[PDB]
Amino acid sequence: DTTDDDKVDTTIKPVEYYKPDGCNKTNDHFTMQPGVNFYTVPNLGPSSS
Amino acid sequence: DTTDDDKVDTTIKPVEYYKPDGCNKTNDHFTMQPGVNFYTVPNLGPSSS
Amino acid sequence: EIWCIAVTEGRKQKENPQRIYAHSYRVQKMCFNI
Amino acid sequence: SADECYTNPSFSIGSSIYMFSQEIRKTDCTTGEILSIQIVLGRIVDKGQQGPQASPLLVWSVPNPKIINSCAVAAGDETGWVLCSVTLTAASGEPIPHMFDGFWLYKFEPDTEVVAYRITGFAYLLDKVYDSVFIGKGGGIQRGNDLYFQMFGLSRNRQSIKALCEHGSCLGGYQVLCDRAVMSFGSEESLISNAYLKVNDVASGKPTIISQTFPPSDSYKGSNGRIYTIGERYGIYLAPSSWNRYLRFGLTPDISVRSTTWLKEKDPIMKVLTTCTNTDKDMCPEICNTRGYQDIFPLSEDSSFYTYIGITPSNEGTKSFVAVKDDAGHVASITILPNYYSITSATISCFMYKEEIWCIAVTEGRKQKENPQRIYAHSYRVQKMCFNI
Amino acid sequence: LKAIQAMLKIIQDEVNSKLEMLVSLDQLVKTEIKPKVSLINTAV
Amino acid sequence: LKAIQAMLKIIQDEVNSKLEMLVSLDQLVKTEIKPKVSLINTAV
Ligand SMILES: *[C@@H]1O[C@H](CO)[C@@H](O)[C@H](O)[C@H]1NC(C)=O
Ligand SMILES: *[C@@H]1O[C@H](CO)[C@@H](O)[C@H](O)[C@H]1NC(C)=O
Ligand SMILES: [Zn+2]
């Protein structure tokens, strides 16, 4: 509860890995896939022409 | 779905023309008309006195 | 929906200098049964 | 700064923009040096507060403030105006107090430079000959391509004086006092009078000025006033300056003297900044000085309803209230500013906001006894009511 | 020697004139910019 | 005496050149910064 008390901005955190929560049954395959969209992130830093 | 992924700002798009979607019946006339209001768009560019 | 912007030259008052103005409107799709 | 005094405020609201002007004098507040004159243009906006809030866009100072008798503002549609009366200067470049040398007119617009015009001897044609001219503090209006302001000053006279002398039951000596009150230094040939001032054809870039004076027979000693717009009609407010301290407000279909008629109401009665001794009941003629200003804002087409702020002197500065007077003569009032030592003046402008009538009052006064004079602004609303007797 | 006196006349005129820009710039920053930066700060 | 004439040549060149920065700076503040500060103020 108190873990974020001293953070100035709480938008993001360090990675907390996914777990097979319930995906442990017979013939049950746990996996990960990328999303379909690939968004732009403008103005990460300065550029020129 | 991915068509807007690389846009910085998605407020407007290029024109996609209207179609007579269902307005193809006997004695059914498809048309277009202007709206009643004519709004101001201030500060399109600099001016002076 | 389709919106349009019109840019025009003119004068607000008779004695004013010429200036450029801009206004916007929309096109409304309509379908009439005769 | 404790050596600076803010006075002679002028405030007017247009469609979305407001004009505000203030003078800064040194120490005296009345006869002290003018250090600067400042004009502010801005908008009235909703900032998530209980009432309407100000938002300055352009702040500008008047050049060569030392040669100005007075300035007043007017506001229209996305534009504002400032009209200043100026005095003569000596060969040394120093101004000569209480003299007249034409007018300056300024035009203000958003995100734009200020345009100045000079109105000189061949541009202004005054009804009579004036030695000194002042522009009414209250401000003026714009109608079409013309501006209307109120003015007063010293007018040369050659006719016999028969001054207006209306009062309540009072114990021809009074007529003599009434005739003397309007004279400057007791000289019959020098009167202090009010007049309308019209600025013609402002859009042409070459404005001219025409005035029209009120005769003594229907006027008291000249004073600060304001021009109002009331639907298709107009109105004029003239502050107390002498023995008559009753409300003086008139209506007219056109900006002219002959067509002007006056209201029969008395409230507010001015009680502050006066040397008069007459009682509020009889208002007997005497020779005295009043230098306050408390205007009103009409809430109906015939000014049968109006809102005003009353001020009364006490042993601890002043006490104040906001009031609305209805067409039956009844007055509803609420006490205001309990934490302020003193308030000496008030000007009121009203507008529609959130589908109801709201008003802003600008006042001069002091928060604490030892403070310098400053200008404050507050807002309130008028609530429509209907009672079954 | 007059060449030197002439040279100083040239130098003085050029410098005294150009430094007018410094006076104007300073007045602008203090009167125009400083005030609105304060207004903007409060707003945000 | 030529030492003095040379000295003035040095002084003039150094000052006249450096003051170009003042002209550029002033143009920048009036053209670039002032306008957007106004735009920002209105927005907020
Ligand atoms: C899977 O995990 C659940 C607990 O969430 C457990 O009850 C169940 O017996 C497990 N099944 C297998 C095959 O591990
Ligand atoms: C109109 O279009 C519809 C499909 O939306 C179609 O079913 C119908 O038969 C068409 N009628 C005519 C006259 O084309
Ligand atoms: Zn009543």
Numbering used by the authors:
A (entry chain C), B (entry chain D): 166 to 214
C (entry chain D): 574 to 607
D (entry chain A): 215 to 385, 390 to 607
E (entry chain B), F (entry chain A): 68 to 111
Sentences from the paper on this structure:
Langya virus (LayV) was recently found in shrews and isolated from febrile patients in China, representing the first human-infecting HNV from shrew origin. Upon G-mediated receptor engagement, F is triggered and promotes membrane fusion and viral entry.
Computational design of optimal residue replacements were aided by ProteinMPNN and visually inspected to generate LayV GSM, comprising the F89L, G98T, G117A, F126V, and Y130L substitutions. LayV G folds as a 150 Å-high and 140 Å-wide fourfold symmetrical tetramer with a central stalk surrounded by four β-propeller head domains. The stalk region built in the cryoEM density comprises residues 68 to 142 and the β-propeller head domain comprises residues 176 to 607. Residues 166 to 175 of the intervening linker region mediates interprotomer interactions with a neighboring head domain. The four LayV G head domains form a fourfold symmetrical clamp around the central stalk with each β-propeller interacting with two neighboring heads and with the stalk helices from two distinct protomers. The LayV G head domain conformation observed in our structure differs from that found in NiV G, as the latter glycoprotein adopts an asymmetric organization of its head domains with only two of them interacting with the stalk. The observed LayV G head conformation and symmetry are unique among characterized paramyxovirus attachment glycoproteins. The stalk is a four-helix coiled coil with intervening pi-helices at residues 97 to 101 and 111 to 115 mediated by prolines at residues 102 and 116, consistent with the NiV G stalk.
